[PDB]
RNA sequence: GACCGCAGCAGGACUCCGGGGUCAGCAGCCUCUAGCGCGGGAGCGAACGCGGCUCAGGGAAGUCGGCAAGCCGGCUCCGUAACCUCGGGAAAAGGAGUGGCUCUGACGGCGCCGGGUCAGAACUGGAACGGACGCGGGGAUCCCGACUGUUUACUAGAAAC
RNA sequence: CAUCCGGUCGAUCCUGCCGGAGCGCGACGCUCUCCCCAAGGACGAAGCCAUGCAUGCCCGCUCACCCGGGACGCGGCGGACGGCUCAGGACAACGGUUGCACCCCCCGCGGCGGUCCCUGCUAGCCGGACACCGCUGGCAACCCGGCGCCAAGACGUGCGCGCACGGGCGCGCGCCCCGCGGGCGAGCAGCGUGACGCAGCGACGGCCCGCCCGGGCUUCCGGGGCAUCACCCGGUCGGCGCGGUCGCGGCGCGCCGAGGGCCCGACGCCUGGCGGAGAAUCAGGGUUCGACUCCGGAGAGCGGGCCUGCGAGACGGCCCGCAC
């Protein structure tokens, strides 16, 4: 709001940035819509100054399909992490499996920050972009380093 | 005979040793000129060729390797010093170039690309009828 | 058509697939268009605002930013609006070589006449920053509607922090 | 398609032209004769003009017809000359009962 | 500036000290200092030389042979083969920029001071920039010698030594 | 639906492969008194096409040296259906599973059917303006030359209920979680307010919303060989804005941060690579092939672009490049 690095201001397009300006008392100040299929989202994610329109709890984003799982192993990507889902494959001439891997891309928001080894859910959503069409919901953080053990989740 | 008519002499620019362009369709990129139709040479004279003058090139390496190693009839289109035409207007055409026609004049490929002078249109006709433009 | 295809774009691994087909017209696109807006009509009257309706699938009609000057703020704080024509495009924000030929973007921050907003005065102070703008006749403004798929003037006025935060780049940067 | 050029040049085998004002010495065979109009004006607007009844507006007499007892295209196997009825170009734009 | 070449001979003679400016430079091109206007002068601008300059179009077709001219070049930045004694080739080859202005950043000492080097931008020049000067043409092979070196001072600088 | 046997030797007992033996599909050859049902230019030629046909149907508006049979055109709708071939295409096409609260749609079908008017108004019906034709033009054809009238269930101007009503705006729920109803699984729609504004149709008033429908993306799980292809991509990969599209999106276009994906084989290369439903032969377990019915995808010599439309980058649509 008075900082002056960004080339523009990033504000919650649903609630004007207008619609406050002196006194604030009777409006609401955070745009939140609660997300379908019912899981819970943590005050921290309901306060703060975090826009994220990828976000679904606050932005204009909504889950509309099934709600796969994976673990986290990249999040340098700009509030972006890269979960691992494994797949095992019953191959019939062999009765034996393949531990076959899929990496696939959401959008965290820093309301819900990651550590490595958590069990992250992925909602099915609107295609954001090239690669992303997921978002992250629930965060199970694993003490010390979970490595992987091909678990689907 | 096959190039038909008479032609005003206009100002002769290429002479033997040029590699002019080639218009056609028919894929031969370039041609090096060896000799022009009915020179009588003077003494150390090298034979020239002007805007619509019989010429026999050679095509080289870039162009298709079936025409290569041969000596084929070609009738020049383009040249680039300045003739003047009985009109007295001095034209002068971008780059020199050259369309293959048979003895008889019938080119190796339907199309000629580019501008085509009006003294080869009048000498050797299908090239008149192919031109896009006879300028 | 100029098409807006996946398989144009490399797979996210590097691939470059082969496209299975041609272009196909409900993939087709557009020309981008570059809006034009009048500082003064003056001694020309080859130039005048004129707005485009497009062809479409389904047959829906597009209205574009072909040529549109006019424009319409309503005030957050009032909820009344005024309509003139807005002095020019001044903070594209994506390029400013943008702003030098007044191509109107989405919520793109503008200079805004005060012709008929200069009424803000009578009311005691409501906005003494909008009050310093409008009696100059040079505000600053956000037309929040889409140009070039609606052809829309109307826009929001700039009002909170975030024009406070535009405002000090617009001020000397 | 190649299109002709709009000032002449030297041909002769194709032109056209009309007379503005010609002026007196219309040709007897040629510009002097004067012909009728054959489709004379069929609609209640052309009634309400070059029919004959301009300042009607929407016509109260509703029905104006220069009979055309013309027979139409391919008779004389038949041989019924008697039947030449007397025919209109239909008459129309009237608000009838129907409208 | 007088030595030695028959001589007051565009020749040969050893060092000492060596300003500024462009520039990488004790280079080239100008310049203070310091010297000084040479076996004379005027016409006339023919042939023909001698020392340069340029040429429409094509270009080695000229010739014993690209002889000679010409092309290239400085700087920065990418891009740099085959082969190979892996050290080279290699500046391979092949591109892009370069001017003047208006400026912004990196570095030694604020209490004032260092030094111009590099980047990064705008804005402008008939569509011009190493604008004079200094300053590689490039690649494909083959034949001899490995090469750095030495040679018949006044006809052979090599494959010879 | 669970099998053999001729062959290494002087013999034997083996391993091991050669060969028969069974069975399907096409050639080929030898051949046919039958009768019935029947595939049929798929096979390194998605090579070239001569010759005909392959999407046509009704005149509201007929005034045509006719008749009750109506030419013609303007219009109306269909030729985006089908038929054909699998060339291209290897996280694609393709089978099934999600969603579209990221979305368009003609036919039909069930609701709605107020539409201010600034202006002109005839608002119980206003225009002028084209074909057909009439008359006379060219060329070797193709190709369609002028003029003259003339009508629309043709095309256009415009009346009508400012809770006008076109979109699109601008703007207005919440109060730490969750339930309520027009609501969903999901705070989504709608309404109100303020500014515009000119969508209706309408000269025989049909716009709108649904339902279906056919698309358009999309989520998972699948979806050839090759490591004598190991590191690869550089809009590449995440954001941040914006344009553009029916639409989400790197899809584009700016702006940034350095990402992506990999021995569980990435990227690359090749394929006489359309996938599936299927087909073959077999105890199980398999193996092999999928071009031909059907289903989806493509493509009409080859690349591009574009029109018309509600939908095609259509190809018995167009226009260009390239061949012929």
Redesign the pocket.
């Given at each position: 709001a008075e900082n002056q690095h960004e080339?523009?201001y990033?504000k919650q397009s649903?609630i004007?940035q207008?619609?406050f300006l002196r006194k604030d008392n009777?409006?609401?100040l955070r745009?939140?819509?609660?997300?379908?299929?019912?899981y819970?989202?943590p005050?921290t994610a309901?306060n703060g100054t975090y826009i994220?329109?990828?976000c679904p709890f606050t932005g204009n984003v909504?889950?509309?399909?099934?709600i796969?799982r994976g673990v986290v192993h990249?999040a340098?990507?700009?509030?972006?992490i890269?979960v691992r889902?494994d797949?095992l494959?019953f191959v019939?001439?062999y009765k034996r499996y393949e531990?076959?891997?899929?990496?696939?891309?959401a959008?965290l928001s820093p309301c819900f920050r990651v550590k490595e080894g958590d069990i992250v859910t992925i909602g099915?959503c609107?295609?954001?972009?090239?690669?992303?069409?997921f978002n992250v919901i629930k965060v199970e953080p694993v003490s010390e380093a979970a490595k992987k053990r091909?678990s689907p989740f | 005979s096959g190039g038909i008519g008479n032609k005003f002499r206009i100002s002769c620019?290429?002479?033997?040793?040029?590699?002019i362009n080639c218009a056609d369709?028919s894929?031969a990129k370039s041609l090096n000129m060896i000799a022009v139709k009915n020179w009588k040479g003077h003494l150390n004279r090298?034979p020239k060729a002007s805007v619509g003058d019989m010429v026999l090139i050679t095509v080289g390496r870039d162009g298709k390797p079936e025409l290569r190693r041969k000596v084929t009839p070609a009738v020049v289109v383009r040249?680039?010093?300045?003739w003047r035409r009985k009109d007295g207007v001095w034209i002068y055409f971008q780059d020199?170039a050259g369309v293959i026609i048979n003895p008889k004049g019938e080119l190796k490929?339907?199309?000629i690309?580019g501008p085509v002078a009006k003294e080869a249109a009048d000498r050797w006709p299908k090239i008149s009828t192919t031109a896009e433009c006879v300028h | 058509?100029?098409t807006?295809?996946?398989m144009?774009?490399?797979?996210?691994?590097?691939?470059?697939?082969?496209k299975?087909?041609?272009?196909?017209?409900?993939?087709?696109?557009?020309?981008?268009?570059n809006t034009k807006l009048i500082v003064k009509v003056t001694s020309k009257k080859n130039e005048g605002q004129k707005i485009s309706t497009?062809?479409?699938?389904?047959?829906?009609?597009?209205?574009?930013?072909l040529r549109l000057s006019h424009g319409?703020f309503?005030w957050?704080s009032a909820?009344?609006?005024?309509?003139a024509r807005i002095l020019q495009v001044v903070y594209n924000?994506?390029?400013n070589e943008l702003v030098r030929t007044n191509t109107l973007?989405?919520?793109?921050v503008v200079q805004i006449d005060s012709a008929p907003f200069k009424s803000a005065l009578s009311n005691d102070t409501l906005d003494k920053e909008i009050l310093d703008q409008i009696r100059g006749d040079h505000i600053l403004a956000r037309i929040?509607?889409?140009?070039?798929?609606?052809?829309?003037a109307?826009?929001?006025?700039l009002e909170g922090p975030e024009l406070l935060f535009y405002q000090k780049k617009l001020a000397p940067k | 398609?190649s299109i002709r050029g709009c000032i002449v040049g030297p041909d002769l085998?194709?032109l056209?032209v009309?007379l503005v004002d010609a002026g007196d010495k219309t040709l007897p065979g040629l510009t002097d004769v004067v012909v009728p109009?054959?489709?004379?004006?069929?609609?209640?607007?052309?009634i309400?003009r070059?029919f004959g009844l301009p300042t009607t507006?929407?016509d109260p007499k509703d029905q104006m017809l220069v009979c055309?007892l013309?027979?139409?295209?391919?008779?004389?196997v038949?041989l019924?000359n008697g039947?030449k009825?007397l025919?209109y170009?239909?008459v129309?734009?009237?608000?009838?009962?129907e409208?």
């Open positions: 080339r523009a990033h649903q004007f207008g619609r009777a409006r609401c745009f939140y819509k609660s997300i379908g299929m019912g819970h989202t005050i309901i994220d329109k990828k909504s889950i509309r399909g099934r796969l990249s340098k990507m700009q509030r972006s890269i889902r797949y494959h019939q001439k531990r076959r891997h899929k990496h696939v891309a959008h099915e609107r295609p954001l972009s090239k690669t992303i069409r091909f | 620019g290429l002479p033997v040793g040029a590699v369709n894929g090298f040249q680039r010093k300045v020199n490929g339907s199309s690309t | 058509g100029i807006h295809d996946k144009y774009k490399r797979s996210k691994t590097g691939a470059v697939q082969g299975w087909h041609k272009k196909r017209k409900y993939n087709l696109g557009r020309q981008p268009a497009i062809r479409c699938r389904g047959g829906n009609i597009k209205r574009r930013a319409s309503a957050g909820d009344i609006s005024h309509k924000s994506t390029s973007v989405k919520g793109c929040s509607s889409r140009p070039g798929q609606v052809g829309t109307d826009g929001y006025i | 398609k085998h194709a056209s009309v109009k054959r489709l004379v004006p069929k609609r209640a607007s052309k309400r070059l507006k929407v055309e013309i027979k139409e295209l391919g008779h004389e038949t019924k039947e009825k025919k170009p239909k129309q734009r009237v608000v009838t009962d409208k």
